[PDB]
């Protein structure tokens, strides 16, 4: 039977008998992580004898 | 509320079973509930939130 009104936006849906709820609980979570590392090492040595 | 044009039983709709549409009258101009009113009927868990 059913035929209770269920809507999402302007569209209307027939809920199956088995379903207690299907509901547009709408959420969004975003995560950005960026890790840049640099190291450099330089060693010049000179030795001169005359 | 029986044989009325509204599903006053919610999951069942037995009040609207075997009902002649010539005997029904328009219960209201509209059927569309407010855009997410169903969320007002959810339970809530205070610890988990």
Give ∠ CA B34-A18-B30 in degrees, rounded to 5: 25
Q: Which helix (H) or strand (E) holds A8?
A: strand A6-8
Question: How many whole angstroms separate alpha carbon A20 and alpha carbon A18?
Answer: 7
Q: Are B7 and A3 in contact (CB under 8 A)?
A: yes
Nearest CA in chain B to A14: B11
Rounded-to-integer distance, Cα A22 and Cα B46, Å: 22
Resolution of the PDB structure in angstroms:
3.3
Residues of B in contact with A21 (CB under 8 A): 38
Residue with tokens 């209307």: A12
Closest-CA residue of A relative to B18 is A1
Experimental method: cryo-EM
Could you tell me which of B5, B21, B22, B23 has the C-alpha nearest to residue B13? Answer: B5
* H/E element, A11: strand A11-13
Q: Is B9 exposed, middle or buried (0-12, 13-18, 19+ CB in 10 A)?
A: middle
Are B23 and B3 spatial neighbours (Cβ–Cβ below 8 Å)? yes
CB contact under 8 A, A1 and B38: no
């Amino acid at each position: 039977g059913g035929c209770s009104p269920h809507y999402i936006l302007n569209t209307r849906f027939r809920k199956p008998y088995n379903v207690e709820s299907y509901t547009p609980q709408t959420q969004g979570k975003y995560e950005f992580i960026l890790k840049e590392y640099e190291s450099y090492s330089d060693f010049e040595r000179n030795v001169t004898e005359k | 509320l029986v044989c009325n044009g509204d599903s006053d039983c919610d999951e069942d709709s037995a009040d609207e079973d075997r009902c002649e549409d010539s005997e029904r009258r328009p219960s209201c101009d509209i059927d569309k509930p407010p855009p997410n009113i169903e969320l007002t009927g959810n339970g809530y868990n205070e610890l988990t939130g």
